Amino acid sequence: GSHMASANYVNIAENKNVSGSNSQSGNPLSNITDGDLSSLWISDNGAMPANATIDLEGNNFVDFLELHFEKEGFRFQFKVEVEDESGNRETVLDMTSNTEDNKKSYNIPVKKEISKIHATITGKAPGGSFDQAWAAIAEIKAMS
Ligand SMILES: CC(=O)N[C@H]1[C@@H](O[C@@H]2[C@H](O)[C@@H](O)[C@H](O)O[C@@H]2CO)O[C@H](CO)[C@@H](O)[C@@H]1O
Numbered sequence: 796g797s798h799m800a801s802a803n804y805v806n807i808a809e810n811k812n813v814s815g816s817n818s819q820s821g822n823p824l825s826n827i828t829d830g831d832l833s834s835l836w837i838s839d840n841g842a843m844p845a846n847a848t849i850d851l852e853g854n855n856f857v858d859f860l861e862l863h864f865e866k867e868g869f870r871f872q873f874k875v876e877v878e879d880e881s882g883n884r885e886t887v888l889d890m891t892s893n894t895e896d897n898k899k900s901y902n903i904p905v906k907k908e909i910s911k912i913h914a915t916i917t918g919k920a921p922g923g924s925f926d927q928a929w930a931a932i933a934e935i936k937a938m939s
């Protein structure tokens with residue numbers, strides 16, 4: 796880890812502010828950083844593009860991000876970006892032109908000092924076993 800005490804990786808995203816687009820009832824934005832992989836954020840009425848921004852309260856080194864979904868199968872099209880205090884922005888997982896299945900979680904290597912995490916579901920790919928699901932994110936973790 797980059798943190799003293801040594802340990803391994805720390806979830807510095809956990810409990811941090813989450814802002815973005817409308818949530819449906821019982822599925823608010825905070826569910827993205829609550830440390831529980833079963834609780835979800837779901838966009839109000841499946842409205843897309845849907846976004847979520849985790850504020851890490853200033854620059855922290857982050858090794859890699861963890862984008863967790865409800866389960867495997869969903870065919871969402873999603874962008875994941877990062878931002879520092881300086882105003883620099885970098886797409887770390889560009890998957891907006893996705894066709895076919897998404898897996899349950901994604902490791903997204905960063906290895907940069909960042910202050911913000913921009914997760915954006917831009918649309919839904921045709922087909923799949925779950926063609927009916929709404930724009931949802933279970934958890935985003937920031938490992939440093
Ligand atoms: C039956 C189905 O497609 N379930 C999905 C889907 O649920 C929708 C919504 O989130 C619920 O609040 C509502 O009661 O049912 C909707 C179906 O029209 O999407 C979510 C993820 O976005 C999944 O949890 C369900 O499995």
Ligand SMILES: [Ca+2]
Nearest residue numbers: 826831834933
């Ligand atoms: Ca959660």
